[PDB]
Ligand SMILES: NC(=[NH2+])c1ccc2nc(C(=O)c3nc4ccc(C(N)=[NH2+])cc4[nH]3)[nH]c2c1
Ligand SMILES: [Ca+2]
Ligand SMILES: [Mg+2]
Ligand SMILES: [Zn+2]
């Protein structure tokens with residue numbers, strides 16, 4: 353997250369850290385047995401860590417569970433990153449409490465103007481590399497599709513939306529990947545891509561989760 357702040361320990365209780373020996377992507381808990389992340393975060397052998405804040409220290413409120421299965425969206429295009437979403441089932445169900453809770457899926461799509469919260473343990477420098485150990489947060493509004501498509505001509509589809517600041521300075525970044533974008537209590541986006549991080553006129557591009565609720569719901573009920 354570049355230009356964001358420290359959330360506070362367990363203040364974003366639906367945030368997850370995907371680990372394959374190290375933290376490589378984030379995810380959101382949707383219920384005791386399922387997580388949603390990005391498809392470009394697909395790897396084999398993933399452990400889902402919940403109640404995390406500092407990912408390098410065991411502070412006591414964590415739950416480390418391995419995944420039993422990963423389902424990448426059937427229409428995911430790794431080249432355009434269109435339909436960049438993946439579901440992860442846990443081997444055991446997480447025990448939900450104040451530090452580990454699930455986030456709700458949207459009933460409709462959010463409007464441009466809406467402020468959301470984006471969180472993750474990804475890079476924090478635009479020019480440089482700094483990886484934090486605690487969760488970083490960023491409040492950012494949904495941008496008009498017009499400004500999104502001008503910045504990325506011919507790259508944006510109806511399953512993507514941009515959020516951020518065109519001036520630059522503030523954006524999600526590598527490592528935040530798969531992470532949540534919550535607007536008004538609903539998970540509206542997943543960190544998908546952008547051009548570098550926090551660059552002027554290069555806002556982040558997020559998977560428009562409101563277009564996948566039927567797919568998510570149908571898949572977790574049948575798996
Ligand atoms: N396991 C891998 N091979 C992997 C995993 C995540 C990655 N993430 C990037 C990346 O390159 C990347 N993830 C981004 C997320 C947000 C923004 C943004 N500017 N908003 C830019 C990003 N760039 N490469 C990745 C490679
Ligand atoms: Ca920890
Ligand atoms: Mg994240
Ligand atoms: Zn990424």
Ligand SMILES: [Zn+2]
Nearest residue numbers: 526546547548
């Ligand atoms: Zn990149």
